[PDB]
Every structure is written in structure tokens, then in C-alpha cells.
Amino acid sequence: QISVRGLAGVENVTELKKNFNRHLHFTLVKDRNVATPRDYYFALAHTVRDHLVGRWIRTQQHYYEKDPKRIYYLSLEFYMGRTLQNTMVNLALENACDEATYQLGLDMEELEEIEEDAGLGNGGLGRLAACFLDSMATLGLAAYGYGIRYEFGIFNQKICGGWQMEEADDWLRYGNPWEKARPEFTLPVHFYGRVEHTSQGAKWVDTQVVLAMPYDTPVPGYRNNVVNTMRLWSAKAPNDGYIQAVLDRNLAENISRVLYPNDNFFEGKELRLKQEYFVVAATLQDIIRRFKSSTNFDAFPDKVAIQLNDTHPSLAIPELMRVLVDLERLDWDKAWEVTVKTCAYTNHTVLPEALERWPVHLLETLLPRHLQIIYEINQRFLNRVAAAFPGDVDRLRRMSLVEEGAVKRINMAHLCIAGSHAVNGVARIHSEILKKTIFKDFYELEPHKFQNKTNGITPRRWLVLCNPGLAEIIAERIGEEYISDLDQLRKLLSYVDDEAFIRDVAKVKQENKLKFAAYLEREYKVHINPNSLFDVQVKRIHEYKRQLLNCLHVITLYNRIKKEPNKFVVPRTVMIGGKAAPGYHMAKMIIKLITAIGDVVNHDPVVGDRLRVIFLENYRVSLAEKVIPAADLSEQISTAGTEASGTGNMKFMLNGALTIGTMDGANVEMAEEAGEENFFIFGMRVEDVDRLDQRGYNAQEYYDRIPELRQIIEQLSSGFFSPKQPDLFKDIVNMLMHHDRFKVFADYEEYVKCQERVSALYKNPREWTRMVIRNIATSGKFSSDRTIAQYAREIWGVEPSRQRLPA
Amino acid sequence: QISVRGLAGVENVTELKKNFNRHLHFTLVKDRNVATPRDYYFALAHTVRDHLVGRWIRTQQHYYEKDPKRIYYLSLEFYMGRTLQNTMVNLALENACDEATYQLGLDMEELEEIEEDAGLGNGGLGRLAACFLDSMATLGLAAYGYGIRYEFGIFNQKICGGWQMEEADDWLRYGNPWEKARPEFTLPVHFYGRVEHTSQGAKWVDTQVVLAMPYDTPVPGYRNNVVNTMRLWSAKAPNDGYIQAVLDRNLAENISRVLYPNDNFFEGKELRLKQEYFVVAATLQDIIRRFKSSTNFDAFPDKVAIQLNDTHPSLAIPELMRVLVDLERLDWDKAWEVTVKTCAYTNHTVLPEALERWPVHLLETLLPRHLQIIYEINQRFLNRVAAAFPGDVDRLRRMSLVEEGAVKRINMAHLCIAGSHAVNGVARIHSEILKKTIFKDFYELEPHKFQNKTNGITPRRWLVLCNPGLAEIIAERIGEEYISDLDQLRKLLSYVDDEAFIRDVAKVKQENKLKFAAYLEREYKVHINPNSLFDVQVKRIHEYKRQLLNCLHVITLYNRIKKEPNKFVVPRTVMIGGKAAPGYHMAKMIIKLITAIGDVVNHDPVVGDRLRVIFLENYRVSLAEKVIPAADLSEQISTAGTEASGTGNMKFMLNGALTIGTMDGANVEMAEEAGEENFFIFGMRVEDVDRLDQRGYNAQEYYDRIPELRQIIEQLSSGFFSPKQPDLFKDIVNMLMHHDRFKVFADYEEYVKCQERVSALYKNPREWTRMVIRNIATSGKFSSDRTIAQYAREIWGVEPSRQRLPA
Ligand SMILES: CC(C)c1ccc(C[C@@H](C)C(=O)N[C@@H]2O[C@H](CO)[C@@H](O)[C@H](O)[C@H]2O)cc1
Ligand SMILES: CC(C)c1ccc(C[C@@H](C)C(=O)N[C@@H]2O[C@H](CO)[C@@H](O)[C@H](O)[C@H]2O)cc1
């Protein structure tokens, strides 16, 4: 039906139909008279999967013959979403399958909705890893993603009486057709035990053994016939009264059971540390085996790069040393040189409560040999510091990997900097913050280590797949090359005064809004005006992301309507969605507040359909793919200095929403690419936040001088939004008035004023749409293809390639 | 190569080859350069499985159209063994696959050895269920086997220093290609809670819910294109801090984790009771759904038969009542009539420690509604007893389902008799014992309930599959019809004087012995003389089976050799194998004793190769298929009255071994079919055992009057067989001398004398072989096809059929 979705060849359509029927009969063991839609989904999935494996086998064959340098991307999270549609898009099969399924009497979009998300991540860090795998395949790199095959991913969120309820995400219940178990590559991982010293060096003995069993998932590049591998490890007990011993096998297997859903506060939990070591130990053995099967580890850094996605896999550093020193008998200095040249570390946050600092006593018990290696690393590192800055004893204690105090801890970030040849932040302002504040000492010691790599998103999933209409009208004007070369979108600047294009952009958006408005009614039974401005804030719930500031704006609009009901205001649907970490009480209160505001606002006859507040339940990748194409306004309103980058921001920009935000994370580079006049910038800069901290932030001052703000706080305290429990929101008021680390009141006035400028522009459709074109046209820098090309050239030492492999 | 293995059509061989390559590439995601033998096995398994599913789908379709009466065979155990070869045999594909694999450069027999046993049973009861499924499919009955998909089957046995060690049988580790998960048919099962009474009857409330997820395995009949289903239930937690709640899901799922390996002593363990209820509750819901999808339960007994394999699924009785009364609102009397006409019960033992007697307090807590129904059943039953035998108060207490004492218990056998229209034993003498002793009261009340159904074995697995040589030379003379009509083997009586046949029988046996002798050396590195008589005792280790009596004979032979070294004796390899229940201390000592005797005997230069004693490790179905065709002598030496039937006995008879045994279980009918002169019968009959019990068994008497016996006991006590721990076997000596329930010494003299007659015959090959022919020729009655035809006609009310379904 549309051109970007590929050819529907008669031969191809015929072949797909017969393979579909083959799988329905032989794979699913069903016939057309009892098959459910779920069965039809699976028969299609298996049909599409068959087209991967030929390319999968020859890609891996190709890497064996050519032996290029291999990139190993280590992460505890891969937030993959659904695979079926992505795979069709990258193989150019979407229209053929559509035709083929239509001819069998089935609607393919209906079948697409049956697939579970692979929710093996929390948010931005996990989704970044998923975008990166896609870009790495698309750019022909010999790359492997390594992680854990969690049995339960991020919880499903239900809202019950306005409160978040968690329920287990049993995503493997019906099977996963994309994975292939590889039990023949099972590897042992050790825990506990103790260290013996001998003439022949140290030995780690009396250990408990857990098996790591790999499951491989294919990762197709965009129309280049490259298919890379994501290898995820599952935990299994070794095979050595009787009944209880068999039931106690569950204790080993609990390692890979569940994704840890805490994305705000570091907790020293043993089970988490076991997960970290497990993925690291199995991956490194696998890496080494692959390297040997092509004595001399001098060439290891020329054949292997290991990228550490935050500190979560930081134990790769002492594990590589353990293997090289204890098992392969390299001398310390040589092993260290190999380790540093092999490893690189990416930081994804500056909030101090988020840094991993493991208690020594845990490491002592679980990984006694690793603690020894860490102490040794620390001592040799601090000797280099002492020699470069003689007499600076304060620097020595600040830079130590060991932190003293009540409990001693290892700082995993310091470990990563010491053992890596490159350290990067994830947007320019974040990388500067790293150098100027929390890693300043390390930057002064080794300035050459520190780099920037601004994040990106894949334009396959985040434009072609989720917004086919937009991709199509773009392709009409400029062709299809932009999909793997997103800088070509600049060519759209020459259509900013073209009346037909202006009309098509606006129509795509409007169709997206109608489609989403319908979805809301169908799956969640309430109605919205699709002529309103769709004001959208979607991301995990955190105080730093300031969903509360949005809440304050919403109540301001409501109060202004009640004050002058018969005055005209631009109507709005305000949508906020996202999950809260289960232990994070304040985040859970914020969700309740949002639903509570909705309860009042949505049932006020005087408001009518001019203002609606919806909490979008169970935000996840599949829901992002629906709501982001329907958005007019993107809320990116974190306190300056707190959002390392953001990636949702880039998704909205690519899909035709305008952005209101602070000068934080990648927003800065986004406004720079589009021009500041085409972005709704407000609020304190990083410099202003600092000045406010020097002085002391006093929230009472703002309450005293802004009557509209005072009125909101009084409504909150008095029970206006919680009539049956007047004090429900006292924790929120109290935090805002006395304990607000993120200075919500300080940006309130400028935010509200900036929101008025948004409303003004929306009244003039033609000029709104013209500003949108200018955003879409300049969004090219934010392709993860750009990001990965920079990692490849400046960190990994490999050259990307856009050349096809033979089909 | 041989005729019974089917045609190797050029078309067929070509097709198998291409499908083999298809699965290797698309299913296993491998190429010929990295494939292991395990991969080749799987590609063949998937190739063969594809030929099942067409027939599977149309068989189940056929039953839907025709709606015959359905047979539901409920068992906690299905001891299936390997599936690949069985499936080829029943589909007539064995020679085609052999050819096809040979042409690909592979040896099919090598690939067959890679398959894991499905060891979902302990022994005779579990293997009987497996033979029965095969016969039911072969006879065209609409039959389903229902059980539990245990994650761990019967343990693997290792012998370490002569002691049994158990290790977990992780049989699903590499996947199971024969099963199909059916998550869409998942059903809820309830536990705990409490009973509320209302105007509208009883309600069972506040229950914990476990999900039952079915996995279907195909069961092919012999060359009739019928494919029945074995449905095995797996336990899953429902989807409703956070981390711990997710990890606690394992508690629900433990229900289906492990096969209970105790086959000697009843233990009231809650987890076992949960397994019993779980299989029962999910199966009954499934049965009812199937019945409704064709109000009126009057026709339920005309459409449904439920066979209870021992008392293990006895809760089907009160569960069917619960469903009919509480949920469908039938009145008690009508529901009871339906239940009795639907259910039938098979007893598989008379040892009192083996009967299930659950403590009331367990039922009270776990299944409070079921206890109520059981009390009500009991009261109405005992009113019928009182009315038939007025004033017989002693009868009332003997027949009660409730047993009083320290702890009150429910007798599950009494429950089964009360709620079933038929009760059967499993060999004629066993069924008579039921009527005369432990169920005498019940027989006097309802004599029409009591039947016999003598056990059998499937001649597909137990002749064609495991002894192709023998099957072939038989087919040369009499054709192939015998394979599904085993009575035709009688025609072989006319070849008992045929010199060529005599020679072929003896050659098959000899080739089987050489093949097995080789296997021993290869997988278990020690050597045996293949010209010796292979004296074999294989079965679970129990005191009643009297492996100890065999041990006493072996030591007698050894002592006679040492006394007269230069005298001639018929050389023997004595093989004993089997597993012991983990908690059964005496059985574990017997295994140690056997290995200990081996240690002395096998390293005595004076003995040479005239006597060897091997303990066959890890006896299981796949090992049975190897050792039984190689046997000359079958040891079936249980104390008269204790082995309900035996089935191993029948396997040996079919495969050309002579039997030495007591007049116990099916041995009685075997000797009757072959003629007593063609069987080595010795020992007390049931009547003699009784007389001895009246008098009092005093083992000292035998020790005092038999010098050879005294010498053995002295060797045992003094440490002859355990030099470094002289008292190791004091428990054994003490049991034999003072506490022997099974009267080992009482049969010693007659056993030893009977063993001399065996040796005498073996010296005359021609006459040995002539006796063998007479056994094989009369083994037809012991086909499970005969057994199942009798269940069908006399219990289930359905007619078997040998007619093909269309291919
Ligand atoms: C529990 C603790 C160890 C922990 C704290 C915080 C997090 C969340 C961090 C790692 C995260 O997701 N950071 C995000 O990374 C994205 C990809 O670089 C950025 O776009 C985003 O700005 C940043 O917050 C995970 C674990
Ligand atoms: C733990 C207790 C409940 C229990 C005791 C004994 C057993 C073993 C019984 C049930 C068994 O296997 N019996 C065998 O059944 C075979 C098939 O009918 C007979 O051939 C054999 O004689 C009999 O012992 C299982 C569980």
C-alpha cells in the first residue's frame, strides 16, 4: 500500500502463504477450524524468522572467515520491545506479509498486537542498548550484546483507585519464537569459596557453581543482510533429603529470575551483585574462547572491545585481571595493559544516590579473589596519583576506589575510570559536568580518557515502524536513503514554504491523533477531543524529571478556567505516563496526585472538553510507539543538570512534536540544531541552579510572591483534590515547601509563561506546522547511527560500513 | 536390511533427507560444519515428528465427529522411555530413516543413544501405564493418558564405592521435541480455604490458586494411523517486597517439580497430596469441558470412563462429587450413581505399608470440602453395610473409610472400592488374594465389583524394537501379523523339532549376548565371558523381591568352587540391577552387599572366568531394552503372595530366556501357558507361607540344619566380604536371623537345587533352545493388547478395533 514498506512480489506472497500454512500445521499442530489469533501470530512469527536464519548463519560464518575486531556491549538491560514488525521492516517484507496475510483472510496489524514486549529494561539506559544493537548491525560491525535472560521483565502497571499496582510480567508464558537456546555452550560461574596462596600464585577454591546457559536472539541490520547476535544468559543448577535437595535448585536459578526495577536509589542487595557477576563471568569466558579459537594476549585489545553500560558490569575489570593473572599466568603489568586497552565505560547519571558503592563485606564473602585484585588495583593507582600530585593527601582519599566510613565500600565508578582507556558521558553538557564536578580529579590526572558521545535513537523503530505515514510523505519528496542516513532530512528545509507539504505534515499528525484517540476509548474506555493540543510527558516517574511541575501547570489552567469560565483557551489533552520504582514512595504519591487531578478536572461541567488530564497506564516501548506519533507537545522539563541526556526527547522531535524544556541533557544540542527560535526553552540554566544553591534555596519566597502558586498549595493542603482524605498530599506539600532538591517553584513562573507562548502558536496551524518541519528537518544528528559511528571510530578503533552482504 | 523394519522407498528416502536438512538449518539454526551428534539426533526427531502430526490432527478430528465413549487413564506415573525408535516402528519408517541417514553419512543407532529416557515413573506401575497407552492406540480406542509433567524424573543412579548415589535427572535440559505446550488450555486448581454453607448449598472459598498448564505428547498405534494423546500437567503461579513476591512463585511451581521416588513405604507428605489433587482437579475439569462441548449428566457414564491407576488419583471420586453437587447442583444420589458408573480402580499391591492412609488433619487443612464429602460417602456406605449384615459391628469398623487411632486417617483403597463399579487385581492369584484377605468384607458385600485383569507388555517395544533379530526369524516362518496378534506365536510350536529354527534362535541369542558384552566394556570398562549363562535379576530393590536370596545362591557357588577348584561347573555371569528408594536403608545395604560380593568373586584367580557378579548401574527402560534380549535366565523369586503380577517376567519370556521363579503373581499363569515342565518352579506356595506363619517362622532352624547356609552367615558376620569394616553387614544378618518378613532361608534349599537343574539343562544347548521355543511360542497371552481388550469389554463397555484410519 505504501512505498517504504517494500515490494509485494507475486512469487514472494505465494511463498509466505505456504510457509504460513506449513507452520500452522507442523509447528503449532493446529488447523484453521480451531486456531486462535494467537496461533496466527505465531505462524507468521515463525514464517518471518525463517528468513533470518540463512542470513544469521552466513553473517556469523563471515565473521569467522574475516576475523574482524569484535565489539562486546555488556548491559544488565536490553529494552527490546516487540520484534515481528521490526524484523519485517529490516528485511523489506512488510508489504509482502501484509498482502500474504490479507489473502489468508487475516489482518496483520491485529496479529502484531498479540506479541509481548521483551521488557528486559527499566527505561532510557535499557532502550539505548536496544537502539545501539540495531545501529551496530545496520553499520556492519561485528557486535554482540550480552546480558541476562530475565524470566520476569519490568512489571506490568495497573492503576487501582489511582494507585500503581505491580504485577509480574510473565513474558515467556506462550514461548518466545525469536530466541534459540544453546545448552551446548553452557558455562560455569563461581561464587563464595576462599583464596589459597601457593608457589604457583593464588587459587580460588571451595566455590559454589552456577551454570550459565545462553539463549541467542538475532539482530537484523537495515536491508544489508547482516544479522548479529544478542546472547542472554540463563541460570541453571549443576546436577549434583533427596526431595528437598531437588527443590533447592531454585536458589541458584533465582539469579536470572527477575529484572531489578529500581532506577533511582542504590541498594546493596546480594542477589543484584550476583546478577552483575553472573553476566560478567559467563560473558568473559565466552569472549576468550572465541578469541582463542581463531598464548599471545598482546593482540587481545586489537581483536576485542568491551563496552560497559554504566558500572553495572564493572566487575569485568577485575574478572579479566583474575583470568589473565591467575589462570593464564600473565604478569600483573601486562595483564593490566591488556585490560585498560580492552575496556571502556559509559556514565549515565550524576545523581550521587545512583552510584554503585558496594560494601566490602559483601565482596569479601561472595568474591574474595576480586576484592584482593581491587585492593591491588587501588594501591597501584594511588601510587600514580601520589607521584603526579605530591603531597596532595586530600586528592588521594577523594580518588581512592575504597571509601572509608561506618561501612567501607568500593566505588565502582572509580574502578571503571581506572581500568578503562575511555570514559564518556551521553550528551555534551553531561560530559562537561563529569569533567568539572564529580570526576574532576580523574580528568586532571588523565584528560585524554574523557570523551562525549551524544545519545541517539534508531530511525527504523522510531520513524518508519511507528509512523509510516510520516515516513512516506518524506520519502515522496526526498527518497528513501534518509532511513540509514538521517542527515538527509535537512533537505526538507527547502519545503518549509511548500503549501502541499505543510498540508501533508498536518494531515499525518491529525490521522495519528485520531488513531490514538480511538485506541484510548477501545482499550481504556474514556473519550478525548482530538482537536485539542496533545500535551505529553512520558518517562519513568522521578522527582528530577519534575512531573510535579507539569502538575502545577495543569492546576493553574484549571483555576484560570474556573475564574473566567467564558473566556477562550486553547483546548488541551494533558497526558502523563510512566512507572514508579516499587520502593519509591514519593513517585508513587505523584502518580496518585495525577489521577486525583484528573478526577476533579475531567468531571467539571464548566471545563467541558477544554482540558482533560489522562494518566497513561503501563507505559512501555509498545505504548511509546503509539503515543509519540500522536503528540503535539513534548515535555522535557528536568531541573538543569540532572537529565544526563534523555532519548524520549529525540523520539518526539523526529515525529513532529514541538518541545518545551529546560537547557538540560540533549535538549541543549536539539535547540542548537533546530535554532532556539524553534524550541520552547525556559527556566534556570545549570549556572543559575548553582547560584541558587550557594545562596540557599528557600521555597517559601516563591509561595509568598506568587498568588497563583499559593492558591495551588492551599488547595493541595486543604483537601480540594482528596475530599475524603484531606491530608493525603501533605508529604508532597511538605517536600515542595521544605525539602525540594529539584527546585520546582523556582521554574514555575517562566514555565507557565512559556506554556502561554505554546498556546499562542497552536492557534496558528500553518506557523505551528512550519516550526515542526524545522524540527524534523534538523533531527538527523540524533540518529543512533551517528552515535555508533562515533563510538566505532573514537573508542573501539573499527570502521563502520554500509555495504550489503550477499543474499 | 530386515523385513519387519518396513520399506525404504526411493521417494520416501529422498523426502526424509530434505526434511532432515530443512530442520538442521531452520529449526536448529546450524550447518553441517558445526553440528554435533546431538544436533543430528534432533533434526531426525523433528523429521519423524512431522509424520505424526497429520495423523494426530485427524485422529482427534475423527473423535470429535464420531463422539465415541472416551477412556481416561489417570496415573501419577508414565514410564515412557525413549520415543524416536518407537515412533519409527509404529509408522513403518525405520528402514527408510536408516537408509536416509546412512546416505547423509550418519549412523542412526548412534543418534538413537543420544535421546534421554522419559523416566516419569519408578517401575512396574509406571511402565504398565506406558504399555497400556500403546495398546490402546493400537486397538483404536479413544483414550487419553493424564498425569504430571515432572521436571525431574526418577533419579540417575551412580555407584560410588559400592553405594548408590542419587543425582537429579534433568531430562528436559536440551528440550523435548515430542511434547507440545498448550498454554491456552490452562486451568485453575484450588487448595486450602474453607467451606461456607448457604441457602444455595456449600461453597469452597478463600482458596489459593495454582494454574495447571497442559503439555500434549502423541501416542501412535501400530500401523493403523491412530495417534492418541498423553496430556501431562505443569504447575504455574497466577500473575497476581516486589522482588520476594516474584521469587515466591517457585512455591506453587514445586508441585510438578519432582517425581516422588518412594515405592515401598507410604508417607503422609503434604507435597505428595498436592500432586495427587493437582492431577485430579485439572483432569476432571478437562474431561467435563470435553463432554459439554459435543445439563444432562445422565449420559456422562455412557461417554466417559475413568480408570484409577492405584489409589494415587483416588481423589477423583470426591472431586467428581464436589463438581456435580456444588457446581452443577445435581442431588447427591444422582451424582453418586454417575460417579460409581464412571470410575474403576486397579490395585497393584497387598503389602499393608504400601496402602495410602492420609491423616485427616492434612485433608482438613488442604481440602476441607473433600473431607466433608468423604465423611458423607462413608456414612451412606456404612448404612448399606449395617442393613446387609445387621448387628455386625466389627464389620462396620473394618469397612469404614475412616480409621480411628492415635491419628485418624482415610483409607483410600476403601474409598476407591466404594466409589467404583469395578475393582481389579493384576494377575489371577493376586485377584483371588484380594477377595480372600484384604478386601474380603467388600467382596461379600458386592461380589460383582471384583474382577481380574492379568497384566501384559507391548510386543512393539518389548520384541520388535529391542530384539529385531528375533522378530525377523519369527516373521520368516509365520509372517508379520503376530505383532498385533501375539497369540499367533503358538504356530511356532510346529518348529520345535526344526533344526534350522533351533539354530537361528540360538544364534540370535548369542549375537544379543555379544552385543551386550561389548556394551558393558565400552560404557562401563570391565570384561565378561559371553559363553557363560547370563543369569539376570533386574527390578527395583525390595526385600520382598529377594535379591538377597539370589545373593545367597551366588556365595554358595563361590564356596563350592573354592572347596573343589578343579571340578567342572557351568560358567555364569550373574547380573543384578535396580534402584533403591532413597530412604530405604535395607535396600541400600543390599546394593552394597552385591557390589561387595563382586569385589571378592571377580578378583579370585581360582574362580577365573567361571563366575562373575556384576551390578548393573542405573537400570531404566533403555537399559532393559538392551539386557533383556541378552538374558538366558530370568530371576523371578519373590516370596509367594507378594508380587501382585510382575511384568519384567513377561519381557524375558518373550525374548528367549528361561524363568526360575516361585508360584507368585503372573509366574503362575506363565507356567500354565508354557507347561510346568518348561519352567523352573521352586519354593513355598502361598498355602505353605500361611502354614509357616501360623506356626511361627524361626530362621535359626534353617541355620542349624544347613551347613552351607551357616557358612555363608558366618562369612557375612565375620567380615569376609568387608575386610576393612568387619561388621558392615550386621544389619543384614540380624534381619535374616530374627526379623525376616519374607522368609529367605525357608526357600534356600529348594532354590539351590532348582539352580542345579538349570545348569544341567544349559550343558545341552539343543534341549535348552527347545525349551526356549516352547516359552516364546506360548507367551502370547501376555500381550497388553489382550489385557486392554479385556478392560475395554468387561469394564469400560467399548469395543476394540484393528481397522486403519486413512492416511
Ligand atoms: C539502582 C541504581 C544502580 C540505578 C540508578 C539509576 C538508574 C538509571 C540510569 C542508569 C539511567 O537509566 N540513566 C539514563 O540513561 C539514558 C541513556 O544514556 C539517558 O538518556 C538518561 O538521561 C539517563 O537518566 C539505574 C540503576
Ligand atoms: C509410596 C507408596 C504410595 C507406594 C508403594 C508402592 C508402590 C509401588 C506399586 C504401586 C507398584 O509398582 N506395583 C507393581 O505394579 C505392577 C503393575 O501392576 C505389578 O506388575 C507389580 O507386581 C507391582 O508390585 C508405589 C507407591
From Swiss-Prot, chains A, B:
Record InterPro entries: Glycg_phsphrylas, Glyco_trans_35, Pyridoxal_P_attach_site
Keyword Oxidoreductase recorded: no
Cofactor requirement: pyridoxal 5'-phosphate
Post-translational modification: Phosphorylation of Ser-3 converts phosphorylase B (unphosphorylated) to phosphorylase A.
EC category name: transferase
GO molecular function, one term: pyridoxal phosphate binding
Residue positions, PTM Phosphotyrosine: 192, 215, 443
Keywords (A to Z) from UniProt: Acetylation, Allosteric enzyme, Carbohydrate metabolism, Glycogen metabolism, Glycosyltransferase, Nucleotide-binding, Phosphoprotein, Pyridoxal phosphate, Transferase
List of residues that carry N6-(pyridoxal phosphate)lysine: 651
Superkingdom: Eukaryota
Phosphoserine, modified sites: 3, 400, 484, 717-718
Site entry: Involved in the association of subunits: 97, 131
Cross-referenced PANTHER family: GLYCOGEN PHOSPHORYLASE (PTHR11468), GLYCOGEN PHOSPHORYLASE, MUSCLE FORM (PTHR11468:SF32)
Quaternary organization: Homodimer. Homotetramer; to form the enzymatically active phosphorylase A.
Role, per record: Allosteric enzyme that catalyzes the rate-limiting step in glycogen catabolism, the phosphorolytic cleavage of glycogen to produce glucose-1-phosphate, and plays a central role in maintaining cellular and organismal glucose homeostasis.
Family, similarity comment: Belongs to the glycogen phosphorylase family.
Record-given protein name: Glycogen phosphorylase, muscle form
Organism: Oryctolagus cuniculus
